[PDB]
Amino acid sequence: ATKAVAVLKGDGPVQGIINFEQKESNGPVKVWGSIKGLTEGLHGFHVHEFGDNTAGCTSAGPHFNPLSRKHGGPKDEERHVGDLGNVTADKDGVADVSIEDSVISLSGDHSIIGRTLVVHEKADDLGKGGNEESTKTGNAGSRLACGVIGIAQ
Amino acid sequence: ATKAVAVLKGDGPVQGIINFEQKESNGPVKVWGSIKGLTEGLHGFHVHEFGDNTAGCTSAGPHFNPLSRKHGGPKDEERHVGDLGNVTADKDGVADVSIEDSVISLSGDHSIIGRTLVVHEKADDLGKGGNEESTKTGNAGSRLACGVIGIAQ
Ligand SMILES: [Cu+]
Ligand SMILES: [Cu+]
Ligand SMILES: [Zn+2]
Ligand SMILES: [Zn+2]
Numbered sequence A, B: 001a002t003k004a005v006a007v008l009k010g011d012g013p014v015q016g017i018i019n020f021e022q023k024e025s026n027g028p029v030k031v032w033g034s035i036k037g038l039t040e041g042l043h044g045f046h047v048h049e050f051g052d053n054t055a056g057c058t059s060a061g062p063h064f065n066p067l068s069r070k071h072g073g074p075k076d077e078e079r080h081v082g083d084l085g086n087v088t089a090d091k092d093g094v095a096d097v098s099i100e101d102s103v104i105s106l107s108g109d110h111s112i113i114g115r116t117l118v119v120h121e122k123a124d125d126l127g128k129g130g131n132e133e134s135t136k137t138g139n140a141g142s143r144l145a146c147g148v149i150g151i152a153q
Helices: none
Strands: A003-009 A015-021 A029-036 A041-048 A054-057 A083-089 A095-101 A116-120 A143-148 B003-008 B015-021 B029-036 B041-048 B054-057 B083-089 B095-101 B116-120 B143-148
Touching: A003 A116, A015 A143, A029 A083, A041 A095, A054 A143, A083 A095, A143 B143, B003 B116, B015 B095, B015 B143, B029 B083, B054 B143, B083 B095
Parallel strands: none
Antiparallel strands: A003 A015, A003 A143, A015 A029, A029 A095, A041 A083, A041 A116, A116 A143, B003 B015, B003 B143, B015 B029, B029 B095, B041 B083, B041 B116, B116 B143
């Protein structure tokens, strides 16, 4: 697809709509939208492997990692395909997301279509935390809201 | 994908979980699960083009129709790829779903992954209604519940 979208919902107040657009079938993917109800500051933001919401965000599984690498920040060569880093919420609890990434795609082997977008409780340490958890989840904490990434127009 | 799942939700009591499994990429897809909160009787069941829930089921667009054909029953040669017919709710408002279809697929250029599964208010006349609306939606009425089809473990 050339456009995708995910509606974020959780058990708390966190909610929002994130759009994805890929101009060329292989080019970078632009990610933008608004998320409200968040605490001010950094919040982990990743694409998880499964688009399964049968048990809330918990059933989405781990980070989308088709190349079986360690967790990292989006700028790192060593990272999960789904590692989009952090998004920042302002004093009013709003995160006006604006990310561009060349690793995720809306088609092919690294396609995030049908997978789950998740926004976390805490900041993602981008794999620089020094413990095993950092190399897996970035120590971003619980999943506050998530949504299945679907094809859009 | 080999497995997929859709969690149906709407503005009313209608909700459910529908599983998808395709043993081989060129094989048929098994669809099964249950939906509750329905009025006894037949209810339209189709895959709509967009996995866009920004406006609830309303933003899902029309029936997935990559081959540009007229609406029909799942067993009709002439039909939308997304046409899965009707599910049947019992006296307790529960419809137990068990279907096998060889038109829809969970992979390939025309995969239903990332699109929307919708359950309708009324019965799908399978495109035999005799009117123009029948050849489009099958007169299935409003969209009671829907969910984005996501990749499952
Ligand atoms: Cu995550
Ligand atoms: Cu439909
Ligand atoms: Zn990761
Ligand atoms: Zn149709």
